[PDB]
Amino acid sequence: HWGYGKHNGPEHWHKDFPIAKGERQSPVDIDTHTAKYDPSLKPLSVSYDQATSLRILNNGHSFQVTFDDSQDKAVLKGGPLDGTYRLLQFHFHWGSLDGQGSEHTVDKKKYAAELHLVHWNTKYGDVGKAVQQPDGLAVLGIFLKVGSAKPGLQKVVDVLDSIKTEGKSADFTNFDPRGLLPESLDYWTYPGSLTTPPLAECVTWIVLKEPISVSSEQVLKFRKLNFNGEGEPEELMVDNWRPAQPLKNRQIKASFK
Ligand SMILES: [Zn+2]
C-alpha cells in the first residue's frame, strides 16, 4: 500500500508504521561541521572479492541485485562494527531530476541518487532475525553525482529494460560490486533505520564521503523503470527517496579529519 505518491508517500507511512516517528529514523542530514572525528573508529573492511550475485529484480519501489549470503563471501567488517556483516543485496534511490534523489544529504545538499549496500550481522543467523536487533544491519551508503560514466555500473543499467515493471527479475550472475565503490572509504556513521517500511531501527549507517560519478545516460535509464506492474498504467519509478528525518538524540561520527 505504501509508496512514494501524494496519498501513500513518506508523510503517510507513520499510520501503518508508527516507528516512522521514532528516535533513530533514517535518512538524516549530515551536518559536516557538527560531525565529530572519532579517532577510535577502527579500520573499515569491505571484502567483496568472493561476492556471488544471483538476480536483479524490480520490487515496485526500487531495483535490487541479490547475493548469496548463505556463507561468508562478501562481508563488511571494521569501522564502527562489531563482528561480520554479510552482503545480501544492493539497490538505489534516485530522483526525477539531477538535483534530488539521495536519501541522506550533506549540509542539505541532495545528490542525484544513493546506492545502499545492505549487510546483516551473522551473529543473528538470518536477516529476518537481524532486523529485530539494534545492531542487526549495516548499510554502506554511497552518493551518486552526474558527470562521467561509472564503468562498473553499466552492466546493471544495460539489463534494466528487462525488469521494467514491478515483479520482473532476471539472472544477474558474476557481477562485481567492487566496481561501484569510490576511491576513498572515508565515512560518516550513525545509528538509524531502514528507509522503507517497516522502518525498523536496526541499521548502523556507514555513509561514504566521496560520491561516485555516473553519466546522465546511466541515470536516465534508472528513470525509465516503472513502479507499476506489467499491463497497468505507467508511473515512472522516480523520486523513490525518503527525506531527511530528525536527528534527535544522536551524534554523527566521522572517520576522517
Ligand atoms: Zn535504500
From Swiss-Prot:
Keyword line: Acetylation, Cell membrane, Cytoplasm, Disease variant, Lyase, Membrane, Metal-binding, Osteopetrosis, Phosphoprotein, Zinc
Pfam families, per database record: Carb_anhydrase
Native organism: Homo sapiens
Originating gene: CA2
A Gene Ontology BP annotation from the UniProt entry: secretion
Result after altering H61G: Impaired activity, not rescued by 4-methylimidazole (4-MI)
Miscellaneous remark of the record: Target of drugs used in treatments against glaucoma disorder and breast cancer.
Protein name: Carbonic anhydrase 2
Effect of V139H: Impaired activity
Residue sites binding substrate per the record: T195, T196
Effect after changing Y4H: Reduced proton transfer rate
